[PDB]
mmCIF file of C-alpha atoms and ligand atoms in Angstrom:
data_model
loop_
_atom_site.group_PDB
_atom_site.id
_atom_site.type_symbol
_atom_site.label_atom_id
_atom_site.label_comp_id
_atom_site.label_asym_id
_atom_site.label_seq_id
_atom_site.Cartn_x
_atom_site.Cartn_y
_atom_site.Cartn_z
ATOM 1 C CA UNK N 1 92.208 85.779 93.128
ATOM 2 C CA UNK N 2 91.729 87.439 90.284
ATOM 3 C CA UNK N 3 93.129 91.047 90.358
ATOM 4 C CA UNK N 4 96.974 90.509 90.365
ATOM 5 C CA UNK N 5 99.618 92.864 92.297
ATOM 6 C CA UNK N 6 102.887 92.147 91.802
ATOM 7 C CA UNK N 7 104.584 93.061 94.612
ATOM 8 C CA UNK N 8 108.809 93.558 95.373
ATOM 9 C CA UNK N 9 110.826 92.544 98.800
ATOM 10 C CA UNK N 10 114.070 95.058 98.919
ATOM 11 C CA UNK N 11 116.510 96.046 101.717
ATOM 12 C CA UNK N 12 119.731 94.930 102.819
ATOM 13 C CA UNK N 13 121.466 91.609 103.201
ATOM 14 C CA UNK N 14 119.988 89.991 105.979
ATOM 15 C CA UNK N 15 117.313 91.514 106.929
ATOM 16 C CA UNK N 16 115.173 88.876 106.710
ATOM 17 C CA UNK N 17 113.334 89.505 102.786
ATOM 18 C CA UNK N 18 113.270 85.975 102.363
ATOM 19 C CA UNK N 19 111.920 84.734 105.872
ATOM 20 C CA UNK N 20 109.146 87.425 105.937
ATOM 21 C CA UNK N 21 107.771 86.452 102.674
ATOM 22 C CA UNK N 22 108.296 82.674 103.858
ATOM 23 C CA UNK N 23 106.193 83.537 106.549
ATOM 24 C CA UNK N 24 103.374 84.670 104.754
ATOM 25 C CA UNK N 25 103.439 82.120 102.158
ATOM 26 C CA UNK N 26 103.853 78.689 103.776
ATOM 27 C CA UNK N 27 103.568 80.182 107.771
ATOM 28 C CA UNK N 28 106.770 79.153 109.132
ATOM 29 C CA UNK N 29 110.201 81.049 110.318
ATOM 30 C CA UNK N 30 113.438 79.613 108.299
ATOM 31 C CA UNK N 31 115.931 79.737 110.799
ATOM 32 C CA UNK N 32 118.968 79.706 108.253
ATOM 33 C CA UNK N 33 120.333 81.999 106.150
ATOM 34 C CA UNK N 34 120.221 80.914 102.597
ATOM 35 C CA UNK N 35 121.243 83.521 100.229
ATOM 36 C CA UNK N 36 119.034 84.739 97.604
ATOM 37 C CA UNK N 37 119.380 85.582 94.010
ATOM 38 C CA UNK N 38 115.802 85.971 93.098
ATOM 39 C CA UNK N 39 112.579 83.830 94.196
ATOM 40 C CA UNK N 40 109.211 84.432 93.193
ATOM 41 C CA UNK N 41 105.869 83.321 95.077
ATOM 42 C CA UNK N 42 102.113 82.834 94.810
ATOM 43 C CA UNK N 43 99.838 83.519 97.099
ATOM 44 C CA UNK N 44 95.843 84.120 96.847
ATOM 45 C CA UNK N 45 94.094 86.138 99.616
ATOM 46 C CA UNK N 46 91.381 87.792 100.698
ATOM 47 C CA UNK N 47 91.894 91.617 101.337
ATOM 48 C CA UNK N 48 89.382 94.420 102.015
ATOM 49 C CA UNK N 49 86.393 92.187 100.690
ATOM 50 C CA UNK N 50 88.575 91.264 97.392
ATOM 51 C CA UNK N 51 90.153 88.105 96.724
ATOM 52 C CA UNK N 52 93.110 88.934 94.993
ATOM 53 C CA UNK N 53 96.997 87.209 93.937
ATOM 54 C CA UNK N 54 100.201 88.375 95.313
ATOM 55 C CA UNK N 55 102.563 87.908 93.136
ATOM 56 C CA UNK N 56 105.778 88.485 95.009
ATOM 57 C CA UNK N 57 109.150 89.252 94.202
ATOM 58 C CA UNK N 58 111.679 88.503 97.353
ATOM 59 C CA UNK N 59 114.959 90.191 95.983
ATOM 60 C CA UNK N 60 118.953 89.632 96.618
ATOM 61 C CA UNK N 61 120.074 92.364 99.457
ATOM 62 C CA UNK N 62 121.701 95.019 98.070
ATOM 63 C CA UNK N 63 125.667 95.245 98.216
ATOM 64 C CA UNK N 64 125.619 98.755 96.385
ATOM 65 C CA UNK N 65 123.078 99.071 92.049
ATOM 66 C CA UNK N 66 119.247 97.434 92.638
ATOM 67 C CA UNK N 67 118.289 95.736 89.862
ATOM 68 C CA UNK N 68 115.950 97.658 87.240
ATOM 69 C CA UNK N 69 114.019 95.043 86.077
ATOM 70 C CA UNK N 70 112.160 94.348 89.196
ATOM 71 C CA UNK N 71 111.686 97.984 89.829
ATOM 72 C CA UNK N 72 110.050 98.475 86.772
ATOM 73 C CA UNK N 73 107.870 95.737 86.989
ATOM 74 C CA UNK N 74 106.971 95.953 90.500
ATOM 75 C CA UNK N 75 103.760 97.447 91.420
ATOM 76 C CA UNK N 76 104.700 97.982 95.037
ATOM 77 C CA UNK N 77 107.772 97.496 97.084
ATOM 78 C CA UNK N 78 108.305 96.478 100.949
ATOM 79 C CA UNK N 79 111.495 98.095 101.941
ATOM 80 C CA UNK N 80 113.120 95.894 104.803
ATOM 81 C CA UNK N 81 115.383 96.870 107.352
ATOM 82 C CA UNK N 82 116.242 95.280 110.920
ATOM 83 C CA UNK N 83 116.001 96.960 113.935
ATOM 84 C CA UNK N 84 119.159 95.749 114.815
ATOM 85 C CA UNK N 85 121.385 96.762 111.348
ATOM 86 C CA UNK N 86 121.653 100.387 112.197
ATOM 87 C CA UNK N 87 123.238 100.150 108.410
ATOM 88 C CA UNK N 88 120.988 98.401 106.962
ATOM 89 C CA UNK N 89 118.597 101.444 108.258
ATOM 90 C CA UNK N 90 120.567 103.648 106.521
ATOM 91 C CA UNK N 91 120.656 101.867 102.989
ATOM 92 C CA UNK N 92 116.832 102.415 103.009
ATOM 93 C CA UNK N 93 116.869 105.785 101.412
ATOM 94 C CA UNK N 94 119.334 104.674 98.449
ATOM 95 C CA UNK N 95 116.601 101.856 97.682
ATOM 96 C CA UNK N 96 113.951 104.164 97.414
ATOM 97 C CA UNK N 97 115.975 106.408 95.223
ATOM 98 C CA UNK N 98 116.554 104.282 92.720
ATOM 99 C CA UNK N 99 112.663 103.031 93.034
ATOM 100 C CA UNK N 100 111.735 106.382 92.101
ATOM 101 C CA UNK N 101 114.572 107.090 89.517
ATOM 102 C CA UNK N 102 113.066 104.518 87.417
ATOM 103 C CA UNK N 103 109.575 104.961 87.930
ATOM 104 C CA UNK N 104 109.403 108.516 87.600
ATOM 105 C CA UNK N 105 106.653 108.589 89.273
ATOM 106 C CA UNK N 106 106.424 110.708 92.610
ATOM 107 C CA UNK N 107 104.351 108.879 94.624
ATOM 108 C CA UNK N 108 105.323 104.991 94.628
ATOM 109 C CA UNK N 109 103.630 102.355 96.589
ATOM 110 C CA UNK N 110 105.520 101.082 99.201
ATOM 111 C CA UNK N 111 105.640 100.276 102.857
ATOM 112 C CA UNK N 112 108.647 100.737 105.447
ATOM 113 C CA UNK N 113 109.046 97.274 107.322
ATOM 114 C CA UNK N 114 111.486 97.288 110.401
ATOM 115 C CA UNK N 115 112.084 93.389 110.951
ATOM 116 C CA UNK N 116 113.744 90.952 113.480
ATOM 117 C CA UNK N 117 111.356 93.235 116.954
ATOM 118 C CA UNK N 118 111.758 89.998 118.490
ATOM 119 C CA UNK N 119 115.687 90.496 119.343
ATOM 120 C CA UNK N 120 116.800 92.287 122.324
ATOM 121 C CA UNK N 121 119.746 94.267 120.722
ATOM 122 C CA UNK N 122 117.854 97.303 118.885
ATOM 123 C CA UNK N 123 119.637 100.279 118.067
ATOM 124 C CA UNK N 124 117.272 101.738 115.294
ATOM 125 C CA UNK N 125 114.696 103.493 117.809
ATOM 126 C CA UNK N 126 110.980 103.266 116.631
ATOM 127 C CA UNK N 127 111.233 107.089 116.195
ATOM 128 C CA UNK N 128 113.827 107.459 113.273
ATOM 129 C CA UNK N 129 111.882 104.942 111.637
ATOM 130 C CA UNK N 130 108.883 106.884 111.963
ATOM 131 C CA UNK N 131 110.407 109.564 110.911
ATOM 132 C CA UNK N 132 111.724 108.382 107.988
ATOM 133 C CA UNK N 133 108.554 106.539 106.626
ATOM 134 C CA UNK N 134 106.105 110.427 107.727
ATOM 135 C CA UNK N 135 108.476 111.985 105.406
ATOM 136 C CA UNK N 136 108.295 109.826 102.976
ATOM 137 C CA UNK N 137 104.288 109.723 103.493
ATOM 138 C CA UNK N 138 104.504 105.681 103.471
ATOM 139 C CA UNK N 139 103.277 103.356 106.113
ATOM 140 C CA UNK N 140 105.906 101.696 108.804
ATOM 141 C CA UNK N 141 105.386 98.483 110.192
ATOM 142 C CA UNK N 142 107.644 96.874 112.762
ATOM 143 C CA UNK N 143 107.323 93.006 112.267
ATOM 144 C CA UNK N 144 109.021 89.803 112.983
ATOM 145 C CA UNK N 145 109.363 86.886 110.758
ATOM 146 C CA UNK N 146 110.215 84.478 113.619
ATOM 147 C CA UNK N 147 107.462 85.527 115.795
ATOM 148 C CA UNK N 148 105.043 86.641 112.429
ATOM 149 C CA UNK N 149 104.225 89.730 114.467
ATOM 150 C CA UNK N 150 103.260 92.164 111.786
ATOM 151 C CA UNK N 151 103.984 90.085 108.725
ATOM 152 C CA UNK N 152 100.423 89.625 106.818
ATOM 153 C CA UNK N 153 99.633 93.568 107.804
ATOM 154 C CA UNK N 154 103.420 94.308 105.909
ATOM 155 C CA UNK N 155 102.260 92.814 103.176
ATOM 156 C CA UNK N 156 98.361 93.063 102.871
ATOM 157 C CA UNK N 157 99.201 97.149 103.749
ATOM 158 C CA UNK N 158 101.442 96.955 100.729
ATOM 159 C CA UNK N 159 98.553 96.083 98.738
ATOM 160 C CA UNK N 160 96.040 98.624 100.078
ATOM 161 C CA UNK N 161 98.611 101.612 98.966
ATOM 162 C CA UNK N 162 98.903 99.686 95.715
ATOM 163 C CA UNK N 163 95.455 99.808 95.537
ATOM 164 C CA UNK N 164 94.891 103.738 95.786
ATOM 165 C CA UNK N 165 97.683 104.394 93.612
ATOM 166 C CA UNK N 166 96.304 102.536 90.448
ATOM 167 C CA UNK N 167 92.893 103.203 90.942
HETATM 168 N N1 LIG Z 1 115.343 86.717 115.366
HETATM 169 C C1 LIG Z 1 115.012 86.918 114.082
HETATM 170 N N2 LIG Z 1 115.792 86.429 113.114
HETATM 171 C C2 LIG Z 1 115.321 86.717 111.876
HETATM 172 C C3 LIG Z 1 114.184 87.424 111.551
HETATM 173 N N3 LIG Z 1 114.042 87.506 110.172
HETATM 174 C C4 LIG Z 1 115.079 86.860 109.699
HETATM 175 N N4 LIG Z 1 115.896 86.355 110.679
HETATM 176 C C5 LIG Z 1 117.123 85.592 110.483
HETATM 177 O O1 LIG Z 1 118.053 86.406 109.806
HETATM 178 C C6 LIG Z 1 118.822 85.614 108.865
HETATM 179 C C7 LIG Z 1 118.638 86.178 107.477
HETATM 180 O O2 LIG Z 1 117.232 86.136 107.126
HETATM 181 P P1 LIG Z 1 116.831 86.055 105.574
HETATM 182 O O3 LIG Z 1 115.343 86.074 105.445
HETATM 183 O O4 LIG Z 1 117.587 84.944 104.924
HETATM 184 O O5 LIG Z 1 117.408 87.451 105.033
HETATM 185 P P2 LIG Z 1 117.407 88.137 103.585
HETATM 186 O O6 LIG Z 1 117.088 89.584 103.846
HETATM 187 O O7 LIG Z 1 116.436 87.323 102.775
HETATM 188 N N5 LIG Z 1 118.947 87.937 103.071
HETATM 189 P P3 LIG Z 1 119.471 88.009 101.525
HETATM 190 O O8 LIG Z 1 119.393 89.422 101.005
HETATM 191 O O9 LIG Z 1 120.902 87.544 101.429
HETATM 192 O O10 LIG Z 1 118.625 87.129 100.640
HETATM 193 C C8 LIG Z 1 118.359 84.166 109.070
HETATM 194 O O11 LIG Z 1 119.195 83.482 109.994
HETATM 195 C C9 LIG Z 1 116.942 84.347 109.621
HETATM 196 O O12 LIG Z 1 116.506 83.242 110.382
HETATM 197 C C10 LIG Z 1 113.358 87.941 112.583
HETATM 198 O O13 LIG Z 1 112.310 88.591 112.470
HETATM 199 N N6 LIG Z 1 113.861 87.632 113.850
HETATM 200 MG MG1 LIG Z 2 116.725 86.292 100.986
#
């Protein structure tokens, strides 16, 4: 494609950054856990009548101290928690924080992504989630890498609220 968005996988160790953007780019679930540092990926598609390149950013989990490189360069982020990390629920509002500390911009595309729906062990209910992202005035999207349920509408969301924001 030929309009670029550069787009920025945060959240928590473990979440499962690095097997939702596997997902969308090559279509299958990693099963392991392989720590990341930093990968970047590729990917043209066709969204809202545009073909367009994603060029994504799938970022180390956060130990608390997000790196400000990538969240100055990123157009839009997908902040990742797992529906089963009640934690790693929590750690979503210190991500955006820092987002908009160095952006200093108000409004910052992004999308709230609660990962891993497939398990059976939730404790983050659908609600605070909800409530979280309607406060926030972001989209939430409940998805799972394993079963891809909600990974390309994550991502190709992510790039519609890009979309208003520059234009
Ligand atoms: N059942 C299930 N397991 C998942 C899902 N997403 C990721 N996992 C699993 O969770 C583990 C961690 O996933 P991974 O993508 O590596 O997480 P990460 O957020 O990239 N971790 P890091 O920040 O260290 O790079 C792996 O064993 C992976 O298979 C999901 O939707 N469902
Ligand atoms: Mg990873």
């Amino acid at each position: 494609g030929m309009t670029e968005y550069k787009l920025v996988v945060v959240g928590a160790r473990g979440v499962g950054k690095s097997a939702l953007t596997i997902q969308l780019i090559q279509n299958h679930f990693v099963d392991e856990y392989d720590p990341t540092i930093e990968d970047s990926y590729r990917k043209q598609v066709v969204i809202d009548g545009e073909t367009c390149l994603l060029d994504i950013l799938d970022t180390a989990g956060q130990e608390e101290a997000m790196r400000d490189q990538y969240m100055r360069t990123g157009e839009g982020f997908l902040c990742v928690f797992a529906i089963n990390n009640t934690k790693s629920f929590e750690d979503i509002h210190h991500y955006r924080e820092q987002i908009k500390r160095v952006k200093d911009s108000e409004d910052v595309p992004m999308v709230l992504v609660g990962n891993k729906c497939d398990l059976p062990s939730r404790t983050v209910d659908t609600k605070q989630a909800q409530d979280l992202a309607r406060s926030y005035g972001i989209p939430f999207i409940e998805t799972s890498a394993k079963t891809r349920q909600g990974v390309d509408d994550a991502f190709y969301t992510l790039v519609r609220e890009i979309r208003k924001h520059k234009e």
